[PDB]
Symmetry: D2
Amino acid sequence: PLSQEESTLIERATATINSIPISEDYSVASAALSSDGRIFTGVNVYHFTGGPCAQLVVLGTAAAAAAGNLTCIVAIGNENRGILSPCGRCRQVLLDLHPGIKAIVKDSDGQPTAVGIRELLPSGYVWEG
Amino acid sequence: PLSQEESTLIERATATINSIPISEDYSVASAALSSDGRIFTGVNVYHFTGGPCAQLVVLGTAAAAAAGNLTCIVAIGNENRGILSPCGRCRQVLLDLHPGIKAIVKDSDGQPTAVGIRELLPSGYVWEG
Amino acid sequence: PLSQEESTLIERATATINSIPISEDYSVASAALSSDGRIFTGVNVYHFTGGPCAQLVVLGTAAAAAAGNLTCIVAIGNENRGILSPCGRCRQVLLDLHPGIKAIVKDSDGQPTAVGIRELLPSGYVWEG
Amino acid sequence: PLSQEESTLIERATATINSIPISEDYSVASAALSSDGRIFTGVNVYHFTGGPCAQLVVLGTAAAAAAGNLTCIVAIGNENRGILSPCGRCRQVLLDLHPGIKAIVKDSDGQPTAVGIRELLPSGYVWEG
Ligand SMILES: CN(CC[C@H](N)CC(=O)N[C@H]1C=C[C@H](n2ccc(N)nc2=O)O[C@@H]1C(=O)O)C(=N)N
Ligand SMILES: CN(CC[C@H](N)CC(=O)N[C@H]1C=C[C@H](n2ccc(N)nc2=O)O[C@@H]1C(=O)O)C(=N)N
Ligand SMILES: CN(CC[C@H](N)CC(=O)N[C@H]1C=C[C@H](n2ccc(N)nc2=O)O[C@@H]1C(=O)O)C(=N)N
Ligand SMILES: CN(CC[C@H](N)CC(=O)N[C@H]1C=C[C@H](n2ccc(N)nc2=O)O[C@@H]1C(=O)O)C(=N)N
Ligand SMILES: C[As](C)(=O)[O-]
Ligand SMILES: C[As](C)(=O)[O-]
Ligand SMILES: C[As](C)(=O)[O-]
Ligand SMILES: C[As](C)(=O)[O-]
Ligand SMILES: [Zn+2]
Ligand SMILES: [Zn+2]
Ligand SMILES: [Zn+2]
Ligand SMILES: [Zn+2]
């Protein structure tokens, strides 16, 4: 079910996306929890050349703070869309940079659940053998 | 040239990259100034699928703070490499998302100089739609 | 167990990667089958800003021939690596542009098997517009 | 001017894009000349994670054929849009993978002109340099 740390991430990313002007360029926020308990937030940057999803912005934000390993991450869409699953590219970046991470997604009953990244990319390509 | 604002960007970005462990994944920092005078920082996230350069992380960090227009931006590499010119992808995202921005690059003498983004993408493709 | 049309894909992509110079930039070949019976090939283009995987080159090659809907796709690595699973970015693009497609991956016994793209991106992010 | 070589690359790219159904996903074609006397074509694959531009599909298609060095490249938009300049990400990939290449862009009078790739990325970021 819904733990406190999980709930806090959802709350943090929701507040971030709700606080900013409605935009088609900046339309999703993410929040991640680090091993040491810090939370890092970000929003996406839309671009046809592969502007970062919100989760990638969060990864650079976390790395800028020397956060180390991230344990959980969630993305929240604008306009009351709620939890969005990480896109395939996010999943690959997460698997390669934070193999221990979980992402919050909606389960088969619509309920938020924290899932190991490996389960979100079955038979995953692993970069560098 | 070298007006206090830009000198400060170089300082902030240099401080950011020197404060984190040496890494091949997180190896460049960026700092941008917003129109209202705030500074935003970030580091890159290396990935073969196009992990964001440090400047793209900065864009998403500024956007998360509702910073609006960014007016200047610099990237500083780790291991005392100093100023790095924005890559071509960065130039395109900057042109499209912050067309009034300047990027700090090195001139012929290897001295910091702030250049209009359009001068870094001569005959630039301008994204419509 | 697979079919024999999917077997043809493996053979074609194997022949492709073994017919070019060994390269760190161009290291994977792909082949896809169109509903109209044609086979399209491609090799990856490595770049830190997100050079396309071999599958994405295949998509553009198929599109350039007005192929329509692709039904199956496989990647074969150089250094005699055999089948590589689509990376998470490939999976997202495939889900979004050819939602009916299957990808050939290695099963537990190390043998080629065709899997629906949706199975490779569970709880998938649904790109709209 | 309009050299026979320029004119042919433009015609090849134009024919390619004009030959496929009008599409928001596949909307630009590219053609490149190789030093070994071949021409390679491709169309873009639009995706928010950074689906390749037409030029990158061309690079993977050239690589698939063991083309080696490409000497000139052009992109042509659908719906009679004519020549499109390479986007900044294309300029970066081209500078890094084919530093000798020229791109066809429009000049001040709207006429086709071939320019060295380095002219399109002044003060260029030099990958692993
Ligand atoms: C023409 N456009 C593009 C408009 C597009 N409809 C914007 C768009 O589709 N953005 C989406 C792209 C990235 C993104 N995304 C997706 C999944 C995820 N887990 N994290 C993300 O940050 O979510 C955004 C979202 O759903 O609004 C612009 N001028 N920006
Ligand atoms: C094998 N690798 C990749 C190692 C690569 N050498 C890392 C690399 O080349 N990173 C580079 C990619 C992005 C980047 N970059 C470049 C220009 C710019 N204006 N901003 C940036 O953020 O700067 C980085 C840099 O110069 O170290 C990993 N395991 N990470
Ligand atoms: C130093 N480098 C980078 C060398 C890198 N090791 C090359 C590299 O890892 N390329 C990888 C990137 C893309 C890619 N790829 C991956 C999965 C997949 N399904 N299809 C692909 O085309 O597979 C390649 C592969 O496994 O050699 C260069 N200058 N190229
Ligand atoms: C498929 N789409 C996106 C619709 C977009 N308007 C399509 C779009 O803008 N595509 C553009 C993206 C890439 C691209 N491009 C650009 C420059 C260049 N030198 N080569 C290219 O291949 O050219 C395309 C073009 O001008 O139609 C959605 N479902 N949102
Ligand atoms: C690691 As958790 C309890 O925030 O999904
Ligand atoms: C702060 As400035 C003059 O480098 O755009
Ligand atoms: C022929 As098949 C099952 O690999 O799409
Ligand atoms: C074929 As050309 C003249 O644009 O290098
Ligand atoms: Zn993503
Ligand atoms: Zn960049
Ligand atoms: Zn891929
Ligand atoms: Zn491009």
